[PDB]
């Protein structure tokens, strides 16, 4: 019942968009449709083109285009969406439709948090719907003739909850006949932004060694691939507990963690959800991929894990050739619930 | 003289 409207600086070009967030359902993406309002008296034989561009910016400034789609809206050369038909009826004869199809396996709108050193433009993946009027596509795009609207490709939490994330490891030591066992689990696989994460830790210490600390952290993994392969680690939540497990003793505790942006504002490169202009966006949602594809995507891939690490007391005849850190990792999903 | 920002309009 409402649409977005942005006009050209001269007022001779207006692009209508029904929404600014287009949901990726892994299999397919929401089609970017719209209506552009032209005036042939101003155009005088020019053509109105609409462009959808997915770019990886740096704001160096290594700006590259990951997907470009261009459509000639005026003069006309897809079936009309009901919204497009209604917009044409509202506007008139000089309103012309455009429609884009975002191919799958493209990045979602992800902004990397800038460091305090630099105050430049945003770095990450963003989409843009640009409408301009020019005689040919080889001509440069003019500011007075063009309208740029930033759109976002988003993903929401899966409707069906996944299997409970569990991990368990075990260590054997030279002077202990029985092993040290660590079990960690989360109460659910899909978490929402701002909601707490409960980590159920079960430590069965049958060794002669005692664990000094249990460090539990939520870490964000950003897979950034433009020129190289690079996975970046960022602990978005931590809990250093002084809980000690005595030798030949067991321990069971539940830890609660909540990742949020207030205490993570000094971490450069931290992935955030796509911004429209400069507003506060929460930590980046987990990107949903195909079940098994083993496919690498040009862009930023965000995933989260909970690392439960035991700090075992040092010493012994064997020495430093043993595990001082017995850790497990619990992959979970941090997303937004589907609206309504 | 500023750049026309994004607004909305009723689709009727």
């Amino acid at each position, epitope marked *: 019942t409402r649409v977005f409207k942005k006009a050209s600086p001269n007022g001779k070009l207006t692009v209508y968009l029904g929404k600014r967030d287009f949901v990726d359902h892994i299999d397919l993406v929401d089609p970017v449709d719209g209506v552009v309002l032209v005036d042939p008296e101003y155009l005088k034989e020019r053509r109105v083109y609409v462009t959808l561009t997915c770019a990886f910016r740096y704001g160096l400034t290594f700006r590259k285009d990951l997907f470009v789609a261009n459509v000639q809206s005026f003069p006309p050369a897809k079936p009309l969406t009901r919204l497009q038909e209604r917009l044409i009826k509202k506007l008139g004869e000089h309103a012309y439709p455009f429609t884009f199809e975002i191919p799958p396996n493209l990045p979602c709108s992800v902004t990397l948090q800038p460091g305090p050193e630099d105050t430049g433009k945003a770095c990450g993946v963003d989409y843009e719907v640009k409408a301009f009027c020019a005689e040919n596509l080889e001509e440069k795009i003019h500011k007075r003739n063009s309208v740029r609207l930033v759109i976002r490709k988003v993903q929401y939490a899966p409707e069906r909850p996944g299997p409970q994330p569990t991990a368990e490891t075990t260590r054997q030591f030279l002077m202990s006949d029985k092993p040290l066992h660590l079990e960690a689990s989360l109460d659910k696989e899909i978490y929402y*932004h701002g909601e707490p994460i409960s980590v159920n830790v079960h430590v069965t210490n049958n060794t002669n060694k005692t664990v000094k600390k249990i460090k539990i952290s939520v870490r964000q993994y950003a897979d950034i691939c433009l020129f190289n392969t690079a996975q970046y680690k960022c602990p978005v939540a931590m809990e250093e507990a002084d809980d000690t497990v005595a030798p030949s003793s067991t321990f069971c505790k539940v830890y609660t963690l909540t990742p949020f942006l207030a205490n993570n*504002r000094e971490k450069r490169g931290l992935a955030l959800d796509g911004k429209l202009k400069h507003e506060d966006t929460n930590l980046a949602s987990s990107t949903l991929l195909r079940e098994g594809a083993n496919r690498e995507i040009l862009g930023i891939i965000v995933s989260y894990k909970v690392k439960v690490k035991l700090v075992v007391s040092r010493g012994g005849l064997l020495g430093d050739l043993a595990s001082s850190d017995v850790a497990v990792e619990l992959p979970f999903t941090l997303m937004h619930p589907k609206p309504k | 003289t500023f750049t026309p920002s994004t607004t909305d309009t*009723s689709t009727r």
Partner: antibody
Amino acid sequence: VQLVESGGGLVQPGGSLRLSCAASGFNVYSSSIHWVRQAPGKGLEWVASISSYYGYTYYADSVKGRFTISADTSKNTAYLQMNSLRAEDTAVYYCARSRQFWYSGLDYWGQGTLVTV
Amino acid sequence: DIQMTQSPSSLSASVGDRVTITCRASQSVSSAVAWYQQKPGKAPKLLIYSASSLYSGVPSRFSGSRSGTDFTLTISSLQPEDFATYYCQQYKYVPVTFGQGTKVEI
């Protein structure tokens, strides 16, 4: 999901009062906590709001400097420090909740505590 | 700031009568407008958000509409439990500003 208040009472002009909002049934990082006063016989007036997810606090121009909104994220409780109070600040102070993602009105309200001054 | 000029200050209607309460925003607050019901001596109750979406649990007789900067709360049928002061909030810009309320009586 319930909000309960405590801390409203009679104070003298220039005095200080602390209002607490024991939030239960929701998380301080998935919600935003707001304070909305209401002078007797008048309409609602927003005074202060806190977002624990972003660590940002907002105040009305009438209470800037004098008032301070806080949150005890461990106890799921928010506090409003009403310093340098004035006679015009007498009202029924309401603690309200809004979704953090995203604001869709003040869906949950407290019962309200009168601050007389 | 932004002023939400709510009209009328108060109206009277019978049971089953149609009541329309109008809100006007000084600036363009988009659809970020909420409506509240506050019976005397109690806390306000959220009715509408986004200027048209009925809050969960609210009876269907409450409807919200927008026309540019003009927002309207309509009560199709006026049951006896619908007599209260109705408030209009915009939450598009800090500070949040409310309407002056509209008392509805017999």
